[PDB]
RNA sequence: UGAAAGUGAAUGCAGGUGGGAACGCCCUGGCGUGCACCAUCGACCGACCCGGAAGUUUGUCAAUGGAAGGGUUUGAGU
RNA sequence: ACCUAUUCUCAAACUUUAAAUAUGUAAGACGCCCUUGUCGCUUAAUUGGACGUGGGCCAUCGAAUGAGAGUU
RNA sequence: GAAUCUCGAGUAGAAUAAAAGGGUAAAAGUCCCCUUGAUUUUGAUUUUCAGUGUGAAUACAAACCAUGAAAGUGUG
RNA sequence: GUCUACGGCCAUACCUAGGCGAAAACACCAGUUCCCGUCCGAUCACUGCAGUUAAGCGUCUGAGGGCCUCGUUAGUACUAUGGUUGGAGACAACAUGGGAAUCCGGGGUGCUGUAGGC
C-alpha cells in the first residue's frame, strides 16, 4: 500500500493558509515580529495582492487574535476616479497604492503634513520627515508569494504608496528602467510606467503590426474610443482626483436582504434522524 | 465533452543518451540545436559507475523540451516515421507516451521522443501560489490519450 | 567511598535553604544600556522638576 | 559522564508528536514587561537563546526586555541558599503565567466586591476559604430505593 | 542466542473455530521465569501424549510463552506474570479429560506452580461460550481459517453486506 | 590613582529615592523628622577610550600644552 | 517473492498515550484606582515604556496552620 | 515508460563535514547570486562552579559592514 | 448567508470517492512588444477579458480511513504511606490515600477576528 492508516494517523498537517498556499509564514514572522523593547507599537504592513482582474492593497497590523486592517483600496474603486480599464496593470497598482497611502494618512492625521509628490516624475525619493514635526507613517511592503523581479507590480504599488506620503523603506533596484550593471534608475522609464506608457506603446505596436490582435486584446479600450495618447492625461487626472478626495464610499446594498436571498441558496445540514432514516432504508432496499 | 477538457500537447522532449562525453556529445548537441532551434541541456551523471567508467556530474546526455507548434510538427514527422503505429505498452498509465527513433536522417544517432499530455487547468499543479491537485475527473488516462491519438491522426494502436 | 549525597540535604536544611534579601531597588546598571542611559536623564529631570515644584 | 549544555535533553527539548514544523506567531505578537511572571518551556526548534535544561518548566519574574529576548530572574537552590539566576531567554521559550493572570483577575474582582460592599454599607469577606465539610441534607428514597449488594463469588474469567 | 523451542502451534492448527469449542489453559500461578528448554520439553510431552491418545486430528495446542527475555549471551527465558497463560489446548467437549491430564503431566516440566483452568470462552477467541453461540446465531460470526471474523459497527456498509449476508442490520 | 610620566577629589543643605533609631504634633494609628546601616540613581578624583579651547615659545604654518564636552569602562577613591 | 484482513507473544537505550510520588510559581499595601510630571529612549503621534508626584481605597490587607525573623 | 528525462503519488521514510541525540519542507536540505558578523570595543548573563579560573555559550550597547525591494538577519 | 484579501487557533481543518454551486468574486483562460526569466513565457514577469465552471475553490453525501471529544475499559493496571502482615522465597493480601492506557461503543467532521464585495 501507499497511503496506509498508520500514514494518516502520523500525518501532521501544515497550517491552514500554508495548505491553501496563501501565506509564507517564514516571511510573515520577520515582517510582523516587533522588538519587545518597543512593546505595543504596531508594525504596519502594506499587503499588495493581485488577482486576474483587480489589485488589492491593504495596510495591516498584527495582533494575537488576528490581523487588523487600518486602510484599504481596491482597484474596483478606480472607476470612481476615472480609471475604468486596465484595472490590474502596473499603473493600476500605482493608483491603488496612492489611494491606500492617502486614506491611511487621512485616518492617521498626517495627510496635510506628508503630501508626497503631487506630480510623479519617476525620481527615486523617500518621504523625508519634518524637523520639528511628527515622523512619517511607516509601512513595510508585503509581496506575498509574488516573485520580486525588476518592474514588478508589487513595487509599483509601493512606489504609488511612497509617493502618496507613506514612508516605505526601499531602493530603486526593482523599479522598471533600473539597470543592474550601472546601478542607475531611468526616471523617464519609471515615469512612463507611472502614467501607463508601456500599455500605450503596446497599442501603438499592435495597431502598426497586428490589427486583429489589437482588437482582441484591447477590445474594451477600442470599443470605448480611447487611443494610446490619452493614457498619460487620464492617469494624471485620476491621481489629482485621488488626492483631492481619497475617502472610501460605503456601498448602499442591503446586507440583510442579500443574506436572506443567499440563505435560500445555501443548503442545510441534515439531521441525525435523517441519518438513520436513509441508512435503514438503504439496508431494506439492499436486502 | 466540455471544451476545457480537450487534450493539448503540453510539451515534447527530445532526449539523446550516448553514455560518453566529448566531441560526440557536442556534435549530438547541435543536432538537437538544428532540429529544435533551441539550446540543448547537458545532463550530468547521477552516479559513479566504474564498470562504465562514469564519474558523477560528468556530461553524458543532452535533452531539449519543445512546446507549441514546433513540438506539434516534430510530433508530426515522428508519427509519420512510425507510420502512426504505436504499441499498447507505449502509453503511460498517467496518459503519456514516447518512442525512440534509430536514425535521425529521415527527419548516426538514435534518440527518444516523449510526449507529455495535459488539459487546460494543470497550472493549478504547476504554479506556486495556491498550488493544488488536479481533480481525478480532470486527470488523463492512457485510454483517453489513445483515443485522442486515434481521432486526431487516424492512427492505429 | 568516592561519592555520595547522603547527609548533604540535611546539612542544607539545618541552616535552611535561605533566600536572598529582597530590595525595592535593583541595579539599573547591569540592565540594557540604552534603557539605563535614558532612565538616568529621565530620573535627573524628575528630581529637578520635583525640586522646582517644591 | 559527559557534561554538555544539552546533555540528557533527548525527551525534554524534543518537539511534541505531530507538533513539529513552524512555530506559531502569537508567540512573537505577545508583550512582556518587567515584573511579568512567565513560564519557561524551551522550544526545540529555536536553538538560539535556549536556556539551560534546568530552567525548562521554571517560572520567574521578567527583569529585562530586549529586541528578541526576555530577561527572567529565577531562584536556584545552590547548596543551602537560593541564588538569583538571570537567564536571557528568547521569547519563543517563554509564555505568560496564567496563575498571575488569574491573580490579577481575582484582584480586580475583589476591588469590585469591596466597592459594592462600601456603597451598600456592608462588609464582604474577601479571603478565600478551603473546602468545608459537607452540610446536613436529606436524601430522598422515592424512586431511588436502595439496592442491597453482596460481594460476588470468585470466578475464573479466563 | 537461538531459542530451543521453535514450533509454537501443534495439532490441527488449521482447524475451524467452530470445530473445537472447549479451551483449557495451563496458567502460571507465580511470578517467575521459564527457560526455552523447559518450554520445548513440555511441548514435546504434550504433543507426544495427545497424538498417542486422541491422535493428531483431535486437538490444537498453542504454547503462548515466548522466550524473549535474555539472561546474562547464553540463552533466552520467558518472564511470566501471575495469571499469565503458558499453554492452551482447544478440543471438543469429549477430550476435556485428555487435555486436563496432558497439561497435568506437562506441569512437571515447568518450574514453580501452574493451574489448569477450563476457560468458559469459546475456543481461543475472547468471546464466552454463550455470547459466541448467540452472535453466531444472529449472524455476525464468519469462520476464517483457524479464527473467525466479527461484524463491527464501523466501516462501510456494502462491504460488510457482501461479506456477512445473514447479518440483520437494524 | 596609574606600569610610569604625571594628574589629583562640593552643580546641589556635600544630592535624590526606599526602608529605618530617637523625637515632635494630632486621634491606636496618622503626620512630620530621620541618626546608623543596607538597595539603588547620580555628582566629583585617577586611570582607560575619544575630543583637542586657550595658553607657553621653539619650530608660529608649527612645537608644546592641556580646557569644555563625551564613554555608561575601571580603582584597594572623595 | 509478495499483497490484504486477521492471530499468539515481547523491548534498558521502540513508542502514540501516560500516572502515583517528587518539582516550579503565584496567592496584593514594594497593593489597587484616578490624576499628573521627567526623558537624549521609543512611537505616525504624550504614542508608549520606566520611574515619579498629588489624591482616593487602607488590616478579612485578600487561603489554612505554625513560628518572632534576618544579616554580618 | 520512451533507445539518461517523462509524470504520478511521496510528513521526510533523504540530506544536514565528522560520534550519538535533538531540530529542519515555499528549510535549517538542494542549486544560484552577492559577500567576509570567522571585524573592533565594552560591560551583563548561562553552563561546569568555590558561583574561583579556563573552555564553550546567550542576550544586548557603542562603532563598522555584508545582504535584501523591505521587514529583518549576520559578533563563524 | 456566500465570495475576496490579511489572519488567529493549526486535521472537527487531512486523505479518498460521488453529487451540487444563482449573483459577484476567484480560478482556469488569450498573447509575448514592454519590465523580467527560462532548454522551453510551461514556471516566473508583463498586457487583457474571447470563453469555461472541466479543474482549483465552496459545499453535501460514505454506519469511508484519519482526527477530535464522551463513555467504557476501570476504581482495573500502577502507585505514596503502614504493620512484630501472610509466605522458605517469588510474591500476595489488607489499611489510609492518589489513579491510568489499548481494545470497544456513541457523538463530531472546523470555529472565529479585521477590512470589504455580493
PDB file of C-alpha atoms in Angstrom, chain A residues 2-3 27 36 38 47 57 70 75-76 168 203 221 251 267 274 283:
ATOM      1  CA  UNK A   2       0.943   3.686  -0.348  1.00  0.00           C
ATOM      2  CA  UNK A   3      -1.323   5.696   2.000  1.00  0.00           C
ATOM      3  CA  UNK A  27       8.412  35.837   5.718  1.00  0.00           C
ATOM      4  CA  UNK A  36       9.956  43.636  22.553  1.00  0.00           C
ATOM      5  CA  UNK A  38       9.171  48.699  21.704  1.00  0.00           C
ATOM      6  CA  UNK A  47      -0.090  43.961   1.701  1.00  0.00           C
ATOM      7  CA  UNK A  57      -3.747  46.901  -1.443  1.00  0.00           C
ATOM      8  CA  UNK A  70      -6.123  50.148   9.001  1.00  0.00           C
ATOM      9  CA  UNK A  75      -8.829  48.698  -7.956  1.00  0.00           C
ATOM     10  CA  UNK A  76     -12.592  48.327  -8.438  1.00  0.00           C
ATOM     11  CA  UNK A 168       8.135  52.810   2.782  1.00  0.00           C
ATOM     12  CA  UNK A 203      -1.412  49.663 -28.553  1.00  0.00           C
ATOM     13  CA  UNK A 221     -10.462  50.357 -24.985  1.00  0.00           C
ATOM     14  CA  UNK A 251     -21.928  50.709  -0.726  1.00  0.00           C
ATOM     15  CA  UNK A 267     -28.279  24.143   1.545  1.00  0.00           C
ATOM     16  CA  UNK A 274     -32.414  11.623   8.582  1.00  0.00           C
ATOM     17  CA  UNK A 283     -30.494  -1.587   4.202  1.00  0.00           C
TER      18      UNK A 283
END
